[PDB]
Symmetry: C4
Subunit: 25 residues, 4 copies
């Protein structure tokens, strides 16, 4: 378990990774 704030920041970072990849594909 995690603070919902920590989960959201985690989803930002993962989505940041996704898009970084997609912009470079």
């Amino acid at each position: 378990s995690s603070d919902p704030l920590v989960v959201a920041a985690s989803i930002i970072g993962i989505l940041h990774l996704i898009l970084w990849i997609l912009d470079r594909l």
Copy 2:
């Protein structure tokens, strides 16, 4: 729950997203 250091790093990443957006609006 989360360690308070993880919460603070979370709040930094969220605020970082906020400001990144604001500077681009």
Copy 3:
């Protein structure tokens, strides 16, 4: 403990640091 999404985002950030270092050595 942490939520696996938080763990995954963590591994991204650590791996990001590693790569940033390696690209600059």
Copy 4:
């Protein structure tokens, strides 16, 4: 509580913020 990996990534993120601030002061 958090996974030590989450704590580690959190410290990276907080130290990244600090350095970012210091390089711009």
